[PDB]
Design a protein around this ligand. Sequence first.
Ligand SMILES: Cc1cc2nc3c(=O)[nH]c(=O)nc-3n(C[C@H](O)[C@H](O)[C@H](O)COP(=O)(O)O)c2cc1C
Ligand SMILES: Cc1cc2nc3c(=O)[nH]c(=O)nc-3n(C[C@H](O)[C@H](O)[C@H](O)COP(=O)(O)O)c2cc1C
Ligand SMILES: O=C(O)c1cc(=O)[nH]c(=O)[nH]1
Ligand SMILES: O=C(O)c1cc(=O)[nH]c(=O)[nH]1
Ligand SMILES: [Mg+2]
Ligand SMILES: [Mg+2]
Lengths: 311, 311
Amino acid sequence: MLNTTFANAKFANPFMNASGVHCMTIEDLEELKASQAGAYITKSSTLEKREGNPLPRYVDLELGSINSMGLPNLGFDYYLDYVLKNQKENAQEGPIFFSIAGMSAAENIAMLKKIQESDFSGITELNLSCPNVPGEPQLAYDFEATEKLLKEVFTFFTKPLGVKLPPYFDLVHFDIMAEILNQFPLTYVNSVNSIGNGLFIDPEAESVVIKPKDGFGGIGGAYIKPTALANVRAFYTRLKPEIQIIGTGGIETGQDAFEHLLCGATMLQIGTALHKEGPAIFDRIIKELEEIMNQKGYQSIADFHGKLKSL
Amino acid sequence: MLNTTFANAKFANPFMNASGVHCMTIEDLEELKASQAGAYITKSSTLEKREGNPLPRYVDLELGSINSMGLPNLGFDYYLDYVLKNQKENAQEGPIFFSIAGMSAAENIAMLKKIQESDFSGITELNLSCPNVPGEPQLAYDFEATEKLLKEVFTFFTKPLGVKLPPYFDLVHFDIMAEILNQFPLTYVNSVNSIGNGLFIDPEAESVVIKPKDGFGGIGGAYIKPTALANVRAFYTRLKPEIQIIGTGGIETGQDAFEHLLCGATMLQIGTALHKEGPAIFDRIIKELEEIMNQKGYQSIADFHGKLKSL
Ligand SMILES: Cc1cc2nc3c(=O)[nH]c(=O)nc-3n(C[C@H](O)[C@H](O)[C@H](O)COP(=O)(O)O)c2cc1C
Ligand SMILES: Cc1cc2nc3c(=O)[nH]c(=O)nc-3n(C[C@H](O)[C@H](O)[C@H](O)COP(=O)(O)O)c2cc1C
Ligand SMILES: O=C(O)c1cc(=O)[nH]c(=O)[nH]1
Ligand SMILES: O=C(O)c1cc(=O)[nH]c(=O)[nH]1
Ligand SMILES: [Mg+2]
Ligand SMILES: [Mg+2]
């Protein structure tokens, strides 16, 4: 029922982990491979290995989560070596996704070239929106810098590429970004990364709950579904059909997944909910979505994909 | 216990309605006056009377609300005539707040001049962030246009003035805006207006819940407290002490109020929660806040105002 075609590849279902969650080590990745997830993506990596920000840096919240991980990762070469060797065993339906989040344009270009030169036949995701690195704003909020980077990227990168975008809240920003993105042979757009620099407070102790950046961190979960759905839908009605979409944000139940698909998303990523529940979430949500489809008499995602009705 | 000094005026408590909620007519305003609210503000007005967007345009949600009112209001002259006549009876402790949201820079300048020329001795709030007007982006997201407007405003407006800002999600944006605002003799900054262009979906009917803008509307309530608290706090540590702050967003309990004050807010505005509960909310939340203060042994807001601790 959930069979999906994305980036010219076949997946058993649209579900994936969101980058940053349950994908730090080879062990995490193999666990995602063994789960019911239709596909998975690696932790955004940087050229060098990173310890990340001081703890506590992640906190579960009643309505979601707040975090300022600081991009902890085992380094580009670690992830590249992994996907390459994995690619050779052909032990899974659908390619693996490789996320990169360079500390600079030079680092991103350098990593993209290594991927281009390697035999990697999977999908690449360029993270233009990490909101938890001190003294480093979000690239995707600088429309000019974003376009400049993408133009250079496409003078050499020919492999499948998607971009992880932060949320937008003004319709003109969607128009500007869509116009920028439509000029490239992009494979997809992933909306959205966590809502940037939010704040949670323990009223009793009268203090923040995470140590870095004075408690400011990216917000995920139920808090952001309205924003995530809007971004997926807004880009769905503005991006040329060649550029598909991955919906990310506030997905916890089959109903949340249904809403994202209804907006126009093809693949779906789970962050906060996966972090709290573990890989078993995929089996649960898959069944929840199929039950919704069965009640409505739908046998394939194409029966409602992108069909959100206006009043 | 909640006595507050703001814009050189005395208020019995920091609570107010948020512009747009329970302040459309003279009758709504008198009801706010009769309530326990420490102060109140009028519905953002335009030079001409406006019917607003087609219904349904506002919907209560489990975690908040979504709306695209379209600035319905009875016109500038209506509100001005009201505050002027009320001013003469001196029937309340603390001045009234007058919100304006011109459809253009010219309309805003025109309204500010009328206020400047009139005998209005109250406080004025310039709304630079209405996210529900079709074909009209948010001014406060255009740093250049915002500064240009404010420079012209201050060549003639000498009365108390505050600005209603949309939420920011990047630390550099806070730096840019603070630098812009600090150059003016601004009375205050009100963070934040609703989270712009979010989307809510009825999964059963497979459609949006509000008619205008294909269902996209401003998000309010619990959904946005993390963002609202961050904006209040971020500006609190960047604005010169002459510019005070009004905290708005996700305030429903005395605890939410406590958090905003802890971040640096002096006055507090309630939107969504007031819309659902009615003016009686003020009596409730006031008692909830005093109970929190009593448990902690605080006798005045100054005992914890702005004292949010970092880890
Ligand atoms: C602990 C944690 C780490 C994350 N790290 C990354 C990351 O490395 N790269 C990335 O693109 N997004 C990262 N994100 C954001 C997610 O990919 C996702 O966009 C966000 O959490 C919104 O989805 P959710 O509502 O399901 O949590 C991270 C989120 C969390 C909670
Ligand atoms: C029905 C409705 C109408 C609103 N109209 C205005 C308005 O005219 N001017 C303004 O500055 N904000 C307006 N807002 C936004 C609020 O003032 C407030 O910033 C927002 O709702 C965030 O607060 P909350 O979480 O308490 O709802 C409106 C909000 C709602 C729900
Ligand atoms: O690793 C992180 O801190 C991080 C990166 C990113 O892109 N998003 C997020 O929420 N956290
Ligand atoms: O009247 C409206 O539509 C409106 C204005 C504004 O500034 N904010 C909001 O949420 N609605
Ligand atoms: Mg598997
Ligand atoms: Mg009263």
